Every structure is written in structure tokens, then in C-alpha cells.
Coordinates of C-alpha atoms in Angstrom, one line a residue:
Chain A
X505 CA -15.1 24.3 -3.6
X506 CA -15.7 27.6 -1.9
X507 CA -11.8 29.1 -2.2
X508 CA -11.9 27.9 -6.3
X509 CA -15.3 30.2 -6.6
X510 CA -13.5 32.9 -4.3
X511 CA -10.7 32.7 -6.5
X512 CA -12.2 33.3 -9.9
X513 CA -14.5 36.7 -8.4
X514 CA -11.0 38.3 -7.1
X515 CA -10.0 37.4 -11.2
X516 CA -12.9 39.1 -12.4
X517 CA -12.1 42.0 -9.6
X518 CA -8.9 42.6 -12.1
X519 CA -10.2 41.8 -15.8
X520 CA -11.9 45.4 -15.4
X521 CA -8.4 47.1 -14.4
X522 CA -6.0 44.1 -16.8
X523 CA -5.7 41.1 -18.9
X524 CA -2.4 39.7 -18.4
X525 CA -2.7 38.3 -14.5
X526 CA -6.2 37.0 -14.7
X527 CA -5.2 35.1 -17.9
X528 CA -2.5 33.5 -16.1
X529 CA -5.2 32.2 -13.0
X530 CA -7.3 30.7 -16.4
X531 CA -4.3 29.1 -17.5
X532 CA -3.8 27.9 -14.0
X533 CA -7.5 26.9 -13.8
X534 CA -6.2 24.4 -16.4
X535 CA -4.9 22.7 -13.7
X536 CA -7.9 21.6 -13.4
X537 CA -9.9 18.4 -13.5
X538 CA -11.2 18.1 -17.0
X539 CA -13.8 15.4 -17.0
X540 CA -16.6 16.9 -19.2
X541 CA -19.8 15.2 -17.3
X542 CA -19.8 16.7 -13.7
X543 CA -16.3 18.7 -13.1
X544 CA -16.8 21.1 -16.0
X545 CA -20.4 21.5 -14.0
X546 CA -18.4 22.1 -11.2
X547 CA -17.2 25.2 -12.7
X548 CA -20.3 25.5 -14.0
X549 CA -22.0 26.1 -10.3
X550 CA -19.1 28.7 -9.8
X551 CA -19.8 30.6 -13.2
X552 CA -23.8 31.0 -12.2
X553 CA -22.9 31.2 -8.2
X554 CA -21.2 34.8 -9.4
X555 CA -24.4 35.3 -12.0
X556 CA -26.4 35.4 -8.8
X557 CA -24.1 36.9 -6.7
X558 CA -23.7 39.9 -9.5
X559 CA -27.9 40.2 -9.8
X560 CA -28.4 40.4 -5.5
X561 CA -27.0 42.9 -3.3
X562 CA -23.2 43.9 -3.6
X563 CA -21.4 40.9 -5.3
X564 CA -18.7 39.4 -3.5
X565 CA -16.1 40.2 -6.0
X566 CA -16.5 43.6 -4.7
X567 CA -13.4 44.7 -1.8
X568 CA -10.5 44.5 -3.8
X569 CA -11.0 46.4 -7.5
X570 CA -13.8 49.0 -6.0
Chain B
X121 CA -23.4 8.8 1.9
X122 CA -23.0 7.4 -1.4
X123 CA -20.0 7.5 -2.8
X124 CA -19.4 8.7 -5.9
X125 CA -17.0 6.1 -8.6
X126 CA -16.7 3.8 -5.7
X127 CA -15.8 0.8 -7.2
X128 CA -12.9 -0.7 -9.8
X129 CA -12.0 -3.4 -11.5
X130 CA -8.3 -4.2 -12.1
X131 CA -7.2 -7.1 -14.2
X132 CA -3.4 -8.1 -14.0
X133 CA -3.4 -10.2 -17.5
X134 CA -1.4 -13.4 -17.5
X135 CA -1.1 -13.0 -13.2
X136 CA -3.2 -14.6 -10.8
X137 CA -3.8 -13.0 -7.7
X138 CA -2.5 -14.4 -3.9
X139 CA -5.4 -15.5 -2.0
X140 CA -4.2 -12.8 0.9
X141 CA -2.2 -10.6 -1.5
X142 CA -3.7 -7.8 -0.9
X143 CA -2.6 -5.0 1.5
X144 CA -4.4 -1.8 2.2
X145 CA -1.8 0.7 4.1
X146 CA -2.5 3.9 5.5
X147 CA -0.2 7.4 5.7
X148 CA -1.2 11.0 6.8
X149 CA -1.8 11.8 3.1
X150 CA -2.2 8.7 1.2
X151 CA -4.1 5.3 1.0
X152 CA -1.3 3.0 -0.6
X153 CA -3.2 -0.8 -2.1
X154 CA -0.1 -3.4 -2.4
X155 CA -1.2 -6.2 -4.0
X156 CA 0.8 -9.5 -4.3
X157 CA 0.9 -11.9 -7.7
X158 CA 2.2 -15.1 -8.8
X159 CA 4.5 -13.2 -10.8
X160 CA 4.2 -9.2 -9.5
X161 CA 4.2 -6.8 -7.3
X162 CA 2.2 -3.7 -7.5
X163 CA 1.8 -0.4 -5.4
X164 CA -1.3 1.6 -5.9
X165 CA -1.4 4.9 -4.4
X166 CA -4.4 7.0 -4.1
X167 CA -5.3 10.4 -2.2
X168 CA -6.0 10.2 1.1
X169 CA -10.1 11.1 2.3
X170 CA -9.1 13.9 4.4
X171 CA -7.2 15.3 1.5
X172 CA -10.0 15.4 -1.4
X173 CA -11.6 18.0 0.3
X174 CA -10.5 21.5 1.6
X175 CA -13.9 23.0 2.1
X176 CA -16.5 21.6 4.6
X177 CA -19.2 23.0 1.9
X178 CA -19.5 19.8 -0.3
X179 CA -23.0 19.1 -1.4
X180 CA -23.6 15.5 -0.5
X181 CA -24.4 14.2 -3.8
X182 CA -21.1 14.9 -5.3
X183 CA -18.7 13.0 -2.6
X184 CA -16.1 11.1 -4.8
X185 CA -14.7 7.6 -3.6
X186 CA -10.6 7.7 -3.0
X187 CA -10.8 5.5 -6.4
X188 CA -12.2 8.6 -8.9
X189 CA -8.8 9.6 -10.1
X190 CA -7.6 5.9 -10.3
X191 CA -7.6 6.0 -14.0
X192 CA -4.7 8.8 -13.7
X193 CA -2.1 6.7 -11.9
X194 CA 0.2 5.5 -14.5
X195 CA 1.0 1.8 -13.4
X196 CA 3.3 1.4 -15.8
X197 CA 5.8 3.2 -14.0
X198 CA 8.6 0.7 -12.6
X199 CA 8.6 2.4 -9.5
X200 CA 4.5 0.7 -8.9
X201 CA 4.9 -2.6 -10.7
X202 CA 8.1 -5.7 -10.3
X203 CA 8.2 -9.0 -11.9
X204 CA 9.2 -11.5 -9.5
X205 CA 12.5 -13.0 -10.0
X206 CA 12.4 -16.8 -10.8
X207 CA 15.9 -17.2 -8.5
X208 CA 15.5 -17.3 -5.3
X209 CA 11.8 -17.1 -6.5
X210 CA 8.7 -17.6 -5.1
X211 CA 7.9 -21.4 -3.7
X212 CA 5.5 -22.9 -6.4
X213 CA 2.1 -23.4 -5.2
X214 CA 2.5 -21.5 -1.9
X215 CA -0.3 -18.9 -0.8
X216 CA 1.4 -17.3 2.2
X217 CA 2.0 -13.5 1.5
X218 CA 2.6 -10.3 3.7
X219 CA 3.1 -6.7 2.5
X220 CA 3.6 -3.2 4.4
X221 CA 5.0 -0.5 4.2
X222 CA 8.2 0.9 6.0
X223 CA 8.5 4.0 8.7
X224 CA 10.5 5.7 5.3
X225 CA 7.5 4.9 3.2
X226 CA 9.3 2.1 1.5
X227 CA 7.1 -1.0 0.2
X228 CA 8.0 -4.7 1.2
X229 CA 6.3 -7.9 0.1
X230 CA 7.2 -11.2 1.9
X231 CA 6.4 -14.5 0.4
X232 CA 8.2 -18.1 0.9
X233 CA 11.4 -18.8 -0.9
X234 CA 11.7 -22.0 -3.3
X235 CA 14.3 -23.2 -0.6
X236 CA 12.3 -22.8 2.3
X237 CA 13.3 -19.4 3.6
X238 CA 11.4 -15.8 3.3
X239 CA 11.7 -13.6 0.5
X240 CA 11.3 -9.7 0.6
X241 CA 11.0 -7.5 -2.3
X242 CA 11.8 -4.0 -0.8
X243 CA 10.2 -1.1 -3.4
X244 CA 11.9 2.3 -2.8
X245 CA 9.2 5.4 -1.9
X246 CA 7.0 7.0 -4.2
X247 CA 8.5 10.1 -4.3
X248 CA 12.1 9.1 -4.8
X249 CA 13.8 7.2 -7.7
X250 CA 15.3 3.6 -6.6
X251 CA 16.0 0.3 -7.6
X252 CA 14.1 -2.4 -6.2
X253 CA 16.3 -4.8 -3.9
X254 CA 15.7 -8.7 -2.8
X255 CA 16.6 -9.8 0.5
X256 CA 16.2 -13.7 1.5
X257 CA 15.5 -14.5 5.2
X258 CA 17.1 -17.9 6.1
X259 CA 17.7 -20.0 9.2
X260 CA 21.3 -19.8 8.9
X261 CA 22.5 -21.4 12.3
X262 CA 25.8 -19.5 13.2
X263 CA 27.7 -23.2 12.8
X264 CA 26.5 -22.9 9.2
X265 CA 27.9 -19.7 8.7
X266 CA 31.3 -20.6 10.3
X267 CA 31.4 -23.5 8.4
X268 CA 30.2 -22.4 4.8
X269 CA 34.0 -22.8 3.7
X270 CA 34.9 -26.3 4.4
X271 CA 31.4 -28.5 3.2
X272 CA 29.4 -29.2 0.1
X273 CA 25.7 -28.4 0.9
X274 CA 25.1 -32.1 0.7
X275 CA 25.5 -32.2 4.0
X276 CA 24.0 -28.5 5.7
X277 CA 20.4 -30.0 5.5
X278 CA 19.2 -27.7 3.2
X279 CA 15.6 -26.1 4.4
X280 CA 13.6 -28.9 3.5
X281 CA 9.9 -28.1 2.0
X282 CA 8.8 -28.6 5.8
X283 CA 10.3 -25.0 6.3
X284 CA 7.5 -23.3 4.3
X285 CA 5.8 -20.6 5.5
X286 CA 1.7 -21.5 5.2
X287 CA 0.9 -18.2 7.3
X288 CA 2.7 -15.0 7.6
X289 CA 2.0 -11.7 9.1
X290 CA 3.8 -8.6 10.3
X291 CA 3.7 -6.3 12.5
X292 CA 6.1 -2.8 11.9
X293 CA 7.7 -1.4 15.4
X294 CA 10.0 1.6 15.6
X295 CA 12.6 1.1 12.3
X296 CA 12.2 -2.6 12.7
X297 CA 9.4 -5.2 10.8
X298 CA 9.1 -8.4 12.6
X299 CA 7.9 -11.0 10.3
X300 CA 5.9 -13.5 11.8
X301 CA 5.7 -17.2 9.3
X302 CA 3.5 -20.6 10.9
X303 CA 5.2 -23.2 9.3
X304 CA 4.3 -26.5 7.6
X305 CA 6.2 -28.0 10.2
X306 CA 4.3 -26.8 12.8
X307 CA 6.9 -23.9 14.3
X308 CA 5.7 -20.2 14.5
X309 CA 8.8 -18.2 13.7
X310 CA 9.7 -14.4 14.4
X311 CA 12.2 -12.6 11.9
X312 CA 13.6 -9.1 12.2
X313 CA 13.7 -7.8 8.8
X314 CA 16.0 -5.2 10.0
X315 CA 18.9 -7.5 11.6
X316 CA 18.0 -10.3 8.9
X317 CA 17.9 -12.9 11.7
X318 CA 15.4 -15.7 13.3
X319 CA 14.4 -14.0 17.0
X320 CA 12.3 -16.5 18.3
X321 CA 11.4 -20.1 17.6
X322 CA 7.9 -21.6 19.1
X323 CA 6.6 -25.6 18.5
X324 CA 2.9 -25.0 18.6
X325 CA 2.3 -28.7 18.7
X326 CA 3.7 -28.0 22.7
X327 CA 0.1 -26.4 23.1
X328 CA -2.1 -29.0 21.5
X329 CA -3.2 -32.4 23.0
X330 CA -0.9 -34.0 20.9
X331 CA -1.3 -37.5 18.5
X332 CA 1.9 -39.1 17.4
X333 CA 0.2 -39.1 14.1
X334 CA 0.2 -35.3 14.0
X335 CA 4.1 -34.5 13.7
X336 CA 4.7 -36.5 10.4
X337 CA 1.9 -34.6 8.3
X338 CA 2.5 -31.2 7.1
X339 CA 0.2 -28.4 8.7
X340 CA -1.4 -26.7 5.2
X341 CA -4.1 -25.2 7.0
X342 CA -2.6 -23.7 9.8
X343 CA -3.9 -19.8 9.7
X344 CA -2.1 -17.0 11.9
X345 CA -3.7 -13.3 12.8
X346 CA -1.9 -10.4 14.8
X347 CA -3.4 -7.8 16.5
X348 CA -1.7 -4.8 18.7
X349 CA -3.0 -2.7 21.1
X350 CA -1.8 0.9 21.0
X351 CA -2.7 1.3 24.9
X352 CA -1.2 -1.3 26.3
X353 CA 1.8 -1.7 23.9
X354 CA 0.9 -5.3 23.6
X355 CA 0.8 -7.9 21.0
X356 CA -1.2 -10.7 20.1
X357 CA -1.2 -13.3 17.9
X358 CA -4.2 -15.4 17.3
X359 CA -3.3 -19.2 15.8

């Protein structure tokens, strides 16, 4: 949903600054679902939702880590 | 809109299921499926459809049915499956059955008694570890109960087979489930569950144009509905 793709853009806001804390909100987002054929491309429309939110205007990842 | 994995198929090998065993309850956060055997009792409990999604921003194409994650419920767990005790047992045969669940989220299953009376199975909540108790509902007149020291039950008339239940329903009020069981021989009967006693007794042959013929045949095909309304605090019961 909408606050799982809001949550992985304020994880890339910190994988410029650190490592450590965005690593842990992967290991978390292994509490995820894991069935391959439509839920892995339900990450997948969050992963290319932030490519074409990082190719338009200022990307919504933006506030937080300027 | 189509539901996504919408549909299951569960086989309960060497059980067949009650014709009315099947109970669909509903709770804030869950949808709980009680389904009555021959020989079981199980308690499926799936997520709630206000709870599957947080964001109003679902493309319609990817709504799941309540039964997607059905394959992660592990119903080997003793707290969702009971084998049926063969003493006081279930009446061979029978195919009355009720189940609900309890104001504390327990489940209950009801089904007729080998000697007449009404059997509960009472599972403990989800969410809590328990052991599964067994209460039998009998008409125990209180001359019976006085006298249960001085005769052999030779004598006490046990419940014959006419005592059966062919119908039950039930309907949950406050911290109370009356159990309502039609009767081969004819009587609707109301049980608190709660107080483990007989409330009411009704002859429903007193509201048919009767033939003499009538009241020596058991009544196998006697059916019995309930329905409450919420507005009125009323209820019915449709024979």
C-alpha cells in the first residue's frame, strides 16, 4: 500500500547519511508476504513508483535527509 | 469486484461433515469458520475484510478474498482442531448441530448426546492457551437430583431416544447462550448454557390440528430457524 512505499523513500532518505537503520527496515520488510507471483510485484510497483518519482519533479523522498 | 483466491477446498480425511455443521461467526477483527464433524471439531480463523487493507488506494484488480492467507493457519494446532469424545459422545446417526462463539471469544459446539441430552464442547480463545472442556445439558428434574442417592437408574426413566434433538439453534444474549433443540418427540426446548438448566418447555403438537396418529411417530424432519431483531429486542423462532 501507500504507507509500505512511503516507508521505503524515508529508508532511502537515510542510505545516503547510513547503513545500519535502513538495513534493519529491509530486515523488517521481511516481514513481509513472500509469495513470488504477485506480492514480490507488489514491491515491485513500489521499487519503479520511486524510479518515477526520482526522474519527475522533486521526489517524495525529499523532506527529511535534504 | 472479483475477488482475488476466493475459493478453498478443505478435506477432513476419515470425517464426514454435519449437514448444518458449519458456522460462520463474525468479530471486530476476525471472521472465525467452526465447522462441526462426525468425529471433530475445528475453528478456522481468518482476517477480517476491514483489516486487509489500510489504504483506500488498492487497484481493483489485486483485491484478495479473506481466504488468501488460508494456507498459513496451522490447523494442526490443538487449540483449532478436537476429536470428539466417544463417552458421553455424540448420538449415532443424528444431524442436529449448533456452534458460536462466546462474548469471551470462546468457541462452543452443541450436538445431541448418546443418552438423549445436549453436548457442548467449549474451545478456549484463540489467543489464550486452554484445555478444551465438555459439558452435558440434561433434563434433570430436581426430584432426580434429590433422589440420585437412594435408586438404580432402572427406574429414573433414562432420556429415552425420543429426547433427541432433530433441530437446534442458538441465539447468544449478554454472558448467556440459550440453546434452543426441536425434539423427536415433538417438544421445542430452551437451555441456558450458562445456568446448565431447561428454561422453557413447549408441545408444538398444541399448535397443529392434531391426528392421534401423529404423537406415536417420531418427528425426523422437524426444522427450526431463529431470527432477532436488534430494534425491537425481539426474538423469533420460525418452526
Amino acid at each position: 500500500k501507500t504507507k509500505h512505499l512511503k516507508a521505503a523513500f524515508l529508508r532511502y532518505c537515510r542510505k545516503d547519511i547510513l547503513g545500519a537503520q535502513s538495513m534493519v527496515d529491509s530486515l523488517f520488510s521481511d516481514s513481509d508476504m513472500e509469495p513470488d507471483d504477485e506480492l514480490d510485484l507488489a514491491v515491485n510497483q513500489i521499487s519503479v513508483d520511486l524510479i518515477d518519482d526520482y526522474p519527475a519533479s522533486d521526489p517524495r523522498w525529499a523532506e527529511s535527509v535534504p | 469486484i472479483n475477488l482475488v483466491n476466493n475459493a478453498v477446498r478443505l478435506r477432513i480425511l476419515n470425517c464426514s461433515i454435519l449437514p448444518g455443521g458449519v458456522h460462520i461467526c463474525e468479530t471486530p477483527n476476525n471472521i472465525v469458520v467452526l465447522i462441526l464433524t462426525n468425529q471433530t471439531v475445528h475453528r478456522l480463523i481468518l482476517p477480517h475484510p476491514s483489516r486487509m487493507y489500510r489504504s483506500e488506494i488498492i487497484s481493483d484488480s489485486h483485491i484478495q478474498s479473506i481466504f488468501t492467507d488460508i494456507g498459513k493457519t496451522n490447523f494442526h494446532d490443538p487449540s483449532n482442531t478436537y476429536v470428539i469424545p466417544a463417552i458421553p459422545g455424540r448420538a449415532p446417526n443424528t444431524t442436529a448441530s449448533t456452534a458460536w462463539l462466546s462474548s469471551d471469544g470462546e468457541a462452543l459446539f452443541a450436538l445431541p448426546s448418546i443418552s438423549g441430552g445436549i453436548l457442548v464442547i467449549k474451545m478456549p480463545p484463540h489467543d489464550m492457551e486452554g484445555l478444551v472442556t465438555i459439558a452435558e445439558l440434561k433434563q434433570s428434574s430436581v426430584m432426580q437430583r434429590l433422589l440420585t442417592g437412594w435408586m438404580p437408574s432402572s427406574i429414573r426413566g433414562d432420556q429415552g431416544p425420543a429426547h433427541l434433538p432433530v433441530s437446534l439453534a442458538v441465539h447468544t444474549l449478554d454472558h448467556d447462550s440459550y440453546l434452543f433443540a426441536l425434539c423427536q418427540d415433538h417438544k421445542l426446548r430452551m437451555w441456558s448454557y450458562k445456568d446448565q438448566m431447561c428454561l422453557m418447555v413447549a408441545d408444538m403438537l398444541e399448535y397443529v390440528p392434531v391426528s392421534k396418529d401423529i404423537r406415536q411417530t417420531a418427528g425426523t424432519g422437524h426444522k427450526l430457524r431463529l431470527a432477532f431483531s436488534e430494534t425491537l429486542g425481539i426474538l423469533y423462532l420460525g418452526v
